[PDB]
Amino acid sequence: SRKFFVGGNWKMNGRKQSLGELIGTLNAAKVPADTEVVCAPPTAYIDFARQKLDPKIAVAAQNCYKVTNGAFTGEISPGMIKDCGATWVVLGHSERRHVFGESDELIGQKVAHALAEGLGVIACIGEKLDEREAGITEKVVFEQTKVIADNVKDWSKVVLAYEPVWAIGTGKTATPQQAQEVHEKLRGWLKSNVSDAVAQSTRIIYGGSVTGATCKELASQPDVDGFLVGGASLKPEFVDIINAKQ
Amino acid sequence: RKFFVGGNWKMNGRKQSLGELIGTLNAAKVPADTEVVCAPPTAYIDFARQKLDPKIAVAAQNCYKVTNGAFTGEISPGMIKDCGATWVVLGHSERRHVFGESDELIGQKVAHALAEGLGVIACIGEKLDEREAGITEKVVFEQTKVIADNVKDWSKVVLAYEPVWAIGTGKTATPQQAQEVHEKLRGWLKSNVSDAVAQSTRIIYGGSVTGATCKELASQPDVDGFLVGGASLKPEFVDIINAKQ
């Protein structure tokens, strides 16, 4: 009773021709029954990607705003995302939080509006190195999860992605037992603060480093339900990561 | 100086509604002395470019400062070019004052956008507290300086003045007050770049413009066009395109 979830976050990479090639590789690749596959292209190519991608793979926006229409030059709404045939949005990504300064409050508002509009939400959380080494990993990720939880009225269309930001571009790495450790406490937070039904049914995916060689061990961790893949989502080894349960 | 009319659609529309607006614009006889540009939501750059007649150019509403990278939710000038858009709006009041984009970031975006071959619609202007404290000129000349520091070729740049102080504050700008700022901005270009750049650089008005008000604003001697807000989503945008006719 928890479907394996592999999301591919292309970030700000690619053009039509290069992403066409990427999409060609994904389409010919055989997706397992038990694996839910989601691709998040750059915002200019949500529409392009959805038209080229086989429908066995869902499309996600990388971000969105918190109202349906408005005076918000540079933003897109969940309504616009649905209109392009995309069914998900990535919210609270480490880069939005830490490069573009998006607050927990704002991320929460965005979650409420996305869910209300009928989109799925990949809600991202994670502690930085200085927070980890200060021994406050739990306080950070629980507070972040709390604000998301405060804006979720139905969890069936939510997926939680833990980003070990402390082990990203920093010369430090996360062992699979350290991934499992955090994932377990997050599911425990859901159990204690939301419900047992939500704790049991909610996918908690891992956003840290994953390769074709570490993906099987990571996937088999009991509280790891799949992946939000960065750089490797642009390469052929995304297919290995999709088949990490096989 | 060729008259410049930009329509900023902001975060509005879907394929249906924007399809019909695009039909309406496609039917419009654009005057030969007037350059027209539409800035759609980022999800619709590609869609709008395919539907829009080539007589109208397409602009992204924002971009980031590198070609490719780990910047979830951002797009680059390369992507904008790749979708067939030839402009980008940068430093819009909403980027500066709602999403916190600094002069440092905006200037860097301007340099990368221009290096990459896009035209830039570069947006400046002062809030009410700044205007009332008497520092209009300081604020807008400083914002213009950061832009100019990152400009080598002004042929690819349009300056947009946004009286942010007039936006839902209880104050509004008259065409005389618009002209005053524009004439000051052009003199800043004369003195700090060249007379040639001052003479040939379109300075466009980015405050409230409608079918009713565009003719008198257009006739101001230092006002070279508009970056249009809400009116750009409607047929009356065509009246604003016709401002100098």
PDB file of N, CA and C in Angstrom, chain A residues 72-154:
ATOM      1  N   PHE A  72       1.517  39.580 -11.103  1.00  0.00           N
ATOM      2  CA  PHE A  72       2.682  38.863 -10.590  1.00  0.00           C
ATOM      3  C   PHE A  72       3.550  38.460 -11.760  1.00  0.00           C
ATOM      4  N   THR A  73       4.101  39.489 -12.404  1.00  0.00           N
ATOM      5  CA  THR A  73       5.040  39.358 -13.514  1.00  0.00           C
ATOM      6  C   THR A  73       6.128  38.332 -13.195  1.00  0.00           C
ATOM      7  N   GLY A  74       6.267  37.355 -14.084  1.00  0.00           N
ATOM      8  CA  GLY A  74       7.209  36.271 -13.927  1.00  0.00           C
ATOM      9  C   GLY A  74       6.662  35.002 -13.286  1.00  0.00           C
ATOM     10  N   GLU A  75       5.447  35.029 -12.741  1.00  0.00           N
ATOM     11  CA  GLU A  75       4.882  33.829 -12.119  1.00  0.00           C
ATOM     12  C   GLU A  75       3.953  33.064 -13.063  1.00  0.00           C
ATOM     13  N   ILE A  76       3.654  31.814 -12.689  1.00  0.00           N
ATOM     14  CA  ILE A  76       2.581  31.017 -13.289  1.00  0.00           C
ATOM     15  C   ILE A  76       1.692  30.425 -12.187  1.00  0.00           C
ATOM     16  N   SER A  77       0.408  30.257 -12.492  1.00  0.00           N
ATOM     17  CA  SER A  77      -0.560  29.692 -11.546  1.00  0.00           C
ATOM     18  C   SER A  77      -0.808  28.221 -11.785  1.00  0.00           C
ATOM     19  N   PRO A  78      -1.292  27.516 -10.749  1.00  0.00           N
ATOM     20  CA  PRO A  78      -1.722  26.125 -10.926  1.00  0.00           C
ATOM     21  C   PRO A  78      -2.726  25.940 -12.068  1.00  0.00           C
ATOM     22  N   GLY A  79      -3.637  26.894 -12.249  1.00  0.00           N
ATOM     23  CA  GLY A  79      -4.561  26.884 -13.388  1.00  0.00           C
ATOM     24  C   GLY A  79      -3.832  26.801 -14.716  1.00  0.00           C
ATOM     25  N   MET A  80      -2.760  27.581 -14.873  1.00  0.00           N
ATOM     26  CA  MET A  80      -1.971  27.537 -16.106  1.00  0.00           C
ATOM     27  C   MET A  80      -1.258  26.194 -16.307  1.00  0.00           C
ATOM     28  N   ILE A  81      -0.792  25.620 -15.200  1.00  0.00           N
ATOM     29  CA  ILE A  81      -0.135  24.307 -15.180  1.00  0.00           C
ATOM     30  C   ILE A  81      -1.096  23.216 -15.679  1.00  0.00           C
ATOM     31  N   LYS A  82      -2.294  23.144 -15.090  1.00  0.00           N
ATOM     32  CA  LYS A  82      -3.354  22.232 -15.573  1.00  0.00           C
ATOM     33  C   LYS A  82      -3.723  22.455 -17.006  1.00  0.00           C
ATOM     34  N   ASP A  83      -3.814  23.716 -17.405  1.00  0.00           N
ATOM     35  CA  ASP A  83      -4.155  24.065 -18.783  1.00  0.00           C
ATOM     36  C   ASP A  83      -3.144  23.502 -19.792  1.00  0.00           C
ATOM     37  N   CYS A  84      -1.875  23.408 -19.392  1.00  0.00           N
ATOM     38  CA  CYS A  84      -0.848  22.753 -20.225  1.00  0.00           C
ATOM     39  C   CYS A  84      -0.801  21.214 -20.123  1.00  0.00           C
ATOM     40  N   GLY A  85      -1.729  20.598 -19.398  1.00  0.00           N
ATOM     41  CA  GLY A  85      -1.757  19.131 -19.285  1.00  0.00           C
ATOM     42  C   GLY A  85      -0.832  18.555 -18.228  1.00  0.00           C
ATOM     43  N   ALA A  86      -0.238  19.421 -17.410  1.00  0.00           N
ATOM     44  CA  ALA A  86       0.592  18.977 -16.285  1.00  0.00           C
ATOM     45  C   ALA A  86      -0.313  18.677 -15.099  1.00  0.00           C
ATOM     46  N   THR A  87       0.066  17.664 -14.325  1.00  0.00           N
ATOM     47  CA  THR A  87      -0.738  17.179 -13.206  1.00  0.00           C
ATOM     48  C   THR A  87      -0.057  17.321 -11.836  1.00  0.00           C
ATOM     49  N   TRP A  88       1.172  17.860 -11.790  1.00  0.00           N
ATOM     50  CA  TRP A  88       1.909  18.024 -10.530  1.00  0.00           C
ATOM     51  C   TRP A  88       2.582  19.381 -10.455  1.00  0.00           C
ATOM     52  N   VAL A  89       2.980  19.766  -9.250  1.00  0.00           N
ATOM     53  CA  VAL A  89       3.899  20.899  -9.065  1.00  0.00           C
ATOM     54  C   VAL A  89       4.911  20.598  -7.947  1.00  0.00           C
ATOM     55  N   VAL A  90       6.160  20.997  -8.173  1.00  0.00           N
ATOM     56  CA  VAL A  90       7.191  20.915  -7.149  1.00  0.00           C
ATOM     57  C   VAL A  90       7.142  22.224  -6.366  1.00  0.00           C
ATOM     58  N   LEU A  91       7.038  22.107  -5.043  1.00  0.00           N
ATOM     59  CA  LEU A  91       6.955  23.252  -4.158  1.00  0.00           C
ATOM     60  C   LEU A  91       7.912  23.099  -2.991  1.00  0.00           C
ATOM     61  N   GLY A  92       8.436  24.233  -2.534  1.00  0.00           N
ATOM     62  CA  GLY A  92       9.448  24.286  -1.472  1.00  0.00           C
ATOM     63  C   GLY A  92      10.817  23.703  -1.787  1.00  0.00           C
ATOM     64  N   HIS A  93      11.179  23.609  -3.066  1.00  0.00           N
ATOM     65  CA  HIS A  93      12.500  23.066  -3.432  1.00  0.00           C
ATOM     66  C   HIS A  93      13.602  23.896  -2.782  1.00  0.00           C
ATOM     67  N   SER A  94      14.646  23.213  -2.327  1.00  0.00           N
ATOM     68  CA  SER A  94      15.795  23.845  -1.660  1.00  0.00           C
ATOM     69  C   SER A  94      16.286  25.121  -2.356  1.00  0.00           C
ATOM     70  N   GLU A  95      16.421  25.064  -3.670  1.00  0.00           N
ATOM     71  CA  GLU A  95      16.784  26.230  -4.491  1.00  0.00           C
ATOM     72  C   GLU A  95      15.796  27.388  -4.422  1.00  0.00           C
ATOM     73  N   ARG A  96      14.497  27.098  -4.368  1.00  0.00           N
ATOM     74  CA  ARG A  96      13.500  28.159  -4.167  1.00  0.00           C
ATOM     75  C   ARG A  96      13.633  28.740  -2.767  1.00  0.00           C
ATOM     76  N   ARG A  97      13.802  27.871  -1.775  1.00  0.00           N
ATOM     77  CA  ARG A  97      13.956  28.309  -0.386  1.00  0.00           C
ATOM     78  C   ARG A  97      15.235  29.111  -0.168  1.00  0.00           C
ATOM     79  N   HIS A  98      16.349  28.627  -0.729  1.00  0.00           N
ATOM     80  CA  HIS A  98      17.694  29.090  -0.333  1.00  0.00           C
ATOM     81  C   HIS A  98      18.410  30.005  -1.330  1.00  0.00           C
ATOM     82  N   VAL A  99      18.045  29.940  -2.604  1.00  0.00           N
ATOM     83  CA  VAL A  99      18.540  30.889  -3.599  1.00  0.00           C
ATOM     84  C   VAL A  99      17.543  32.036  -3.788  1.00  0.00           C
ATOM     85  N   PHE A 100      16.245  31.735  -3.824  1.00  0.00           N
ATOM     86  CA  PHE A 100      15.219  32.750  -4.074  1.00  0.00           C
ATOM     87  C   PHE A 100      14.367  33.081  -2.837  1.00  0.00           C
ATOM     88  N   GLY A 101      14.810  32.626  -1.670  1.00  0.00           N
ATOM     89  CA  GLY A 101      14.305  33.132  -0.405  1.00  0.00           C
ATOM     90  C   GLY A 101      12.840  32.888  -0.137  1.00  0.00           C
ATOM     91  N   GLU A 102      12.278  31.806  -0.654  1.00  0.00           N
ATOM     92  CA  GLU A 102      10.856  31.544  -0.430  1.00  0.00           C
ATOM     93  C   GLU A 102      10.614  31.072   1.010  1.00  0.00           C
ATOM     94  N   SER A 103       9.718  31.750   1.720  1.00  0.00           N
ATOM     95  CA  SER A 103       9.445  31.450   3.128  1.00  0.00           C
ATOM     96  C   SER A 103       8.576  30.217   3.274  1.00  0.00           C
ATOM     97  N   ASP A 104       8.627  29.614   4.462  1.00  0.00           N
ATOM     98  CA  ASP A 104       7.686  28.553   4.842  1.00  0.00           C
ATOM     99  C   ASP A 104       6.225  29.013   4.668  1.00  0.00           C
ATOM    100  N   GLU A 105       5.927  30.246   5.089  1.00  0.00           N
ATOM    101  CA  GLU A 105       4.583  30.825   4.951  1.00  0.00           C
ATOM    102  C   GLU A 105       4.127  30.813   3.499  1.00  0.00           C
ATOM    103  N   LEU A 106       4.987  31.299   2.614  1.00  0.00           N
ATOM    104  CA  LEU A 106       4.638  31.371   1.198  1.00  0.00           C
ATOM    105  C   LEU A 106       4.482  29.973   0.608  1.00  0.00           C
ATOM    106  N   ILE A 107       5.412  29.082   0.939  1.00  0.00           N
ATOM    107  CA  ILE A 107       5.359  27.716   0.436  1.00  0.00           C
ATOM    108  C   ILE A 107       4.033  27.069   0.868  1.00  0.00           C
ATOM    109  N   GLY A 108       3.637  27.274   2.127  1.00  0.00           N
ATOM    110  CA  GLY A 108       2.336  26.792   2.620  1.00  0.00           C
ATOM    111  C   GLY A 108       1.131  27.287   1.824  1.00  0.00           C
ATOM    112  N   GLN A 109       1.081  28.593   1.585  1.00  0.00           N
ATOM    113  CA  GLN A 109       0.021  29.203   0.773  1.00  0.00           C
ATOM    114  C   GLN A 109      -0.059  28.605  -0.630  1.00  0.00           C
ATOM    115  N   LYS A 110       1.106  28.422  -1.245  1.00  0.00           N
ATOM    116  CA  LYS A 110       1.232  27.788  -2.558  1.00  0.00           C
ATOM    117  C   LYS A 110       0.713  26.356  -2.551  1.00  0.00           C
ATOM    118  N   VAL A 111       0.980  25.618  -1.479  1.00  0.00           N
ATOM    119  CA  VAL A 111       0.482  24.238  -1.355  1.00  0.00           C
ATOM    120  C   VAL A 111      -1.048  24.232  -1.323  1.00  0.00           C
ATOM    121  N   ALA A 112      -1.638  25.070  -0.469  1.00  0.00           N
ATOM    122  CA  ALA A 112      -3.091  25.155  -0.351  1.00  0.00           C
ATOM    123  C   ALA A 112      -3.760  25.467  -1.691  1.00  0.00           C
ATOM    124  N   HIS A 113      -3.219  26.436  -2.426  1.00  0.00           N
ATOM    125  CA  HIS A 113      -3.816  26.829  -3.703  1.00  0.00           C
ATOM    126  C   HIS A 113      -3.652  25.745  -4.774  1.00  0.00           C
ATOM    127  N   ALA A 114      -2.467  25.132  -4.851  1.00  0.00           N
ATOM    128  CA  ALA A 114      -2.233  24.042  -5.817  1.00  0.00           C
ATOM    129  C   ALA A 114      -3.186  22.857  -5.624  1.00  0.00           C
ATOM    130  N   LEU A 115      -3.289  22.391  -4.384  1.00  0.00           N
ATOM    131  CA  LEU A 115      -4.185  21.274  -4.042  1.00  0.00           C
ATOM    132  C   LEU A 115      -5.639  21.618  -4.318  1.00  0.00           C
ATOM    133  N   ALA A 116      -6.034  22.839  -3.970  1.00  0.00           N
ATOM    134  CA  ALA A 116      -7.402  23.301  -4.204  1.00  0.00           C
ATOM    135  C   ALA A 116      -7.716  23.344  -5.690  1.00  0.00           C
ATOM    136  N   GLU A 117      -6.712  23.656  -6.511  1.00  0.00           N
ATOM    137  CA  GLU A 117      -6.899  23.705  -7.960  1.00  0.00           C
ATOM    138  C   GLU A 117      -6.962  22.341  -8.664  1.00  0.00           C
ATOM    139  N   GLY A 118      -6.579  21.266  -7.965  1.00  0.00           N
ATOM    140  CA  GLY A 118      -6.624  19.890  -8.495  1.00  0.00           C
ATOM    141  C   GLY A 118      -5.273  19.314  -8.915  1.00  0.00           C
ATOM    142  N   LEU A 119      -4.186  20.024  -8.618  1.00  0.00           N
ATOM    143  CA  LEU A 119      -2.829  19.529  -8.877  1.00  0.00           C
ATOM    144  C   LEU A 119      -2.338  18.644  -7.730  1.00  0.00           C
ATOM    145  N   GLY A 120      -1.419  17.741  -8.069  1.00  0.00           N
ATOM    146  CA  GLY A 120      -0.600  17.044  -7.093  1.00  0.00           C
ATOM    147  C   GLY A 120       0.558  17.934  -6.704  1.00  0.00           C
ATOM    148  N   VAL A 121       1.110  17.687  -5.521  1.00  0.00           N
ATOM    149  CA  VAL A 121       2.173  18.526  -4.981  1.00  0.00           C
ATOM    150  C   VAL A 121       3.314  17.661  -4.473  1.00  0.00           C
ATOM    151  N   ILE A 122       4.511  17.894  -5.009  1.00  0.00           N
ATOM    152  CA  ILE A 122       5.728  17.321  -4.460  1.00  0.00           C
ATOM    153  C   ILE A 122       6.275  18.414  -3.545  1.00  0.00           C
ATOM    154  N   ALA A 123       6.069  18.252  -2.240  1.00  0.00           N
ATOM    155  CA  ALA A 123       6.464  19.260  -1.248  1.00  0.00           C
ATOM    156  C   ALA A 123       7.828  18.905  -0.673  1.00  0.00           C
ATOM    157  N   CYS A 124       8.779  19.824  -0.807  1.00  0.00           N
ATOM    158  CA  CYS A 124      10.170  19.537  -0.520  1.00  0.00           C
ATOM    159  C   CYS A 124      10.567  20.126   0.818  1.00  0.00           C
ATOM    160  N   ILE A 125      11.424  19.406   1.532  1.00  0.00           N
ATOM    161  CA  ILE A 125      11.920  19.817   2.855  1.00  0.00           C
ATOM    162  C   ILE A 125      13.376  19.401   2.987  1.00  0.00           C
ATOM    163  N   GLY A 126      14.073  19.971   3.966  1.00  0.00           N
ATOM    164  CA  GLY A 126      15.467  19.627   4.190  1.00  0.00           C
ATOM    165  C   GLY A 126      16.254  20.623   5.004  1.00  0.00           C
ATOM    166  N   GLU A 127      17.268  20.122   5.709  1.00  0.00           N
ATOM    167  CA  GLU A 127      18.127  20.962   6.532  1.00  0.00           C
ATOM    168  C   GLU A 127      19.459  21.222   5.833  1.00  0.00           C
ATOM    169  N   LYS A 128      20.031  22.386   6.122  1.00  0.00           N
ATOM    170  CA  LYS A 128      21.345  22.763   5.611  1.00  0.00           C
ATOM    171  C   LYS A 128      22.430  22.165   6.498  1.00  0.00           C
ATOM    172  N   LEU A 129      23.675  22.304   6.054  1.00  0.00           N
ATOM    173  CA  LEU A 129      24.816  21.776   6.794  1.00  0.00           C
ATOM    174  C   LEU A 129      24.912  22.392   8.183  1.00  0.00           C
ATOM    175  N   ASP A 130      24.893  23.725   8.262  1.00  0.00           N
ATOM    176  CA  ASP A 130      24.977  24.420   9.564  1.00  0.00           C
ATOM    177  C   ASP A 130      23.858  24.049  10.558  1.00  0.00           C
ATOM    178  N   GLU A 131      22.676  23.725  10.044  1.00  0.00           N
ATOM    179  CA  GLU A 131      21.560  23.252  10.872  1.00  0.00           C
ATOM    180  C   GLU A 131      21.810  21.804  11.315  1.00  0.00           C
ATOM    181  N   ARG A 132      22.307  20.970  10.402  1.00  0.00           N
ATOM    182  CA  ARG A 132      22.619  19.582  10.741  1.00  0.00           C
ATOM    183  C   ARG A 132      23.725  19.497  11.783  1.00  0.00           C
ATOM    184  N   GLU A 133      24.853  20.149  11.502  1.00  0.00           N
ATOM    185  CA  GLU A 133      26.000  20.167  12.420  1.00  0.00           C
ATOM    186  C   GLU A 133      25.687  20.882  13.755  1.00  0.00           C
ATOM    187  N   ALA A 134      24.693  21.785  13.772  1.00  0.00           N
ATOM    188  CA  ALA A 134      24.149  22.325  15.035  1.00  0.00           C
ATOM    189  C   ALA A 134      23.186  21.375  15.773  1.00  0.00           C
ATOM    190  N   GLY A 135      22.929  20.191  15.212  1.00  0.00           N
ATOM    191  CA  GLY A 135      22.057  19.186  15.824  1.00  0.00           C
ATOM    192  C   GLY A 135      20.577  19.539  15.895  1.00  0.00           C
ATOM    193  N   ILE A 136      20.070  20.250  14.893  1.00  0.00           N
ATOM    194  CA  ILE A 136      18.657  20.641  14.850  1.00  0.00           C
ATOM    195  C   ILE A 136      17.992  20.200  13.534  1.00  0.00           C
ATOM    196  N   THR A 137      18.457  19.081  12.972  1.00  0.00           N
ATOM    197  CA  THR A 137      17.830  18.470  11.801  1.00  0.00           C
ATOM    198  C   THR A 137      16.323  18.277  12.001  1.00  0.00           C
ATOM    199  N   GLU A 138      15.945  17.696  13.137  1.00  0.00           N
ATOM    200  CA  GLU A 138      14.541  17.366  13.393  1.00  0.00           C
ATOM    201  C   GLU A 138      13.664  18.594  13.513  1.00  0.00           C
ATOM    202  N   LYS A 139      14.133  19.608  14.231  1.00  0.00           N
ATOM    203  CA  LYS A 139      13.341  20.821  14.400  1.00  0.00           C
ATOM    204  C   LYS A 139      13.071  21.508  13.061  1.00  0.00           C
ATOM    205  N   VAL A 140      14.080  21.531  12.196  1.00  0.00           N
ATOM    206  CA  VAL A 140      13.957  22.180  10.899  1.00  0.00           C
ATOM    207  C   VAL A 140      12.920  21.433  10.048  1.00  0.00           C
ATOM    208  N   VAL A 141      13.126  20.133   9.836  1.00  0.00           N
ATOM    209  CA  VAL A 141      12.288  19.380   8.893  1.00  0.00           C
ATOM    210  C   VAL A 141      10.859  19.183   9.415  1.00  0.00           C
ATOM    211  N   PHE A 142      10.693  19.066  10.740  1.00  0.00           N
ATOM    212  CA  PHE A 142       9.346  19.041  11.358  1.00  0.00           C
ATOM    213  C   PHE A 142       8.611  20.370  11.223  1.00  0.00           C
ATOM    214  N   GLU A 143       9.296  21.489  11.451  1.00  0.00           N
ATOM    215  CA  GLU A 143       8.674  22.799  11.253  1.00  0.00           C
ATOM    216  C   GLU A 143       8.246  23.014   9.798  1.00  0.00           C
ATOM    217  N   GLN A 144       9.128  22.652   8.877  1.00  0.00           N
ATOM    218  CA  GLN A 144       8.828  22.728   7.455  1.00  0.00           C
ATOM    219  C   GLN A 144       7.631  21.832   7.092  1.00  0.00           C
ATOM    220  N   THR A 145       7.663  20.580   7.556  1.00  0.00           N
ATOM    221  CA  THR A 145       6.574  19.617   7.337  1.00  0.00           C
ATOM    222  C   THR A 145       5.279  20.100   7.994  1.00  0.00           C
ATOM    223  N   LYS A 146       5.392  20.721   9.169  1.00  0.00           N
ATOM    224  CA  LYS A 146       4.227  21.279   9.853  1.00  0.00           C
ATOM    225  C   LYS A 146       3.522  22.314   8.997  1.00  0.00           C
ATOM    226  N   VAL A 147       4.283  23.243   8.421  1.00  0.00           N
ATOM    227  CA  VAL A 147       3.660  24.308   7.629  1.00  0.00           C
ATOM    228  C   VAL A 147       2.987  23.703   6.382  1.00  0.00           C
ATOM    229  N   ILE A 148       3.648  22.750   5.726  1.00  0.00           N
ATOM    230  CA  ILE A 148       3.007  22.021   4.626  1.00  0.00           C
ATOM    231  C   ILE A 148       1.729  21.363   5.152  1.00  0.00           C
ATOM    232  N   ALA A 149       1.855  20.582   6.225  1.00  0.00           N
ATOM    233  CA  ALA A 149       0.717  19.889   6.837  1.00  0.00           C
ATOM    234  C   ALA A 149      -0.447  20.837   7.172  1.00  0.00           C
ATOM    235  N   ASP A 150      -0.130  22.033   7.677  1.00  0.00           N
ATOM    236  CA  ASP A 150      -1.151  23.067   7.945  1.00  0.00           C
ATOM    237  C   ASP A 150      -1.963  23.478   6.705  1.00  0.00           C
ATOM    238  N   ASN A 151      -1.444  23.257   5.494  1.00  0.00           N
ATOM    239  CA  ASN A 151      -2.141  23.635   4.248  1.00  0.00           C
ATOM    240  C   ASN A 151      -2.644  22.488   3.380  1.00  0.00           C
ATOM    241  N   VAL A 152      -2.621  21.287   3.941  1.00  0.00           N
ATOM    242  CA  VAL A 152      -3.035  20.080   3.251  1.00  0.00           C
ATOM    243  C   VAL A 152      -4.323  19.602   3.919  1.00  0.00           C
ATOM    244  N   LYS A 153      -5.410  19.547   3.146  1.00  0.00           N
ATOM    245  CA  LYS A 153      -6.695  18.976   3.587  1.00  0.00           C
ATOM    246  C   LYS A 153      -6.956  17.561   3.038  1.00  0.00           C
ATOM    247  N   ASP A 154      -6.165  17.149   2.043  1.00  0.00           N
ATOM    248  CA  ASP A 154      -6.235  15.810   1.462  1.00  0.00           C
ATOM    249  C   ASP A 154      -4.830  15.396   1.042  1.00  0.00           C
TER     250      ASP A 154
END
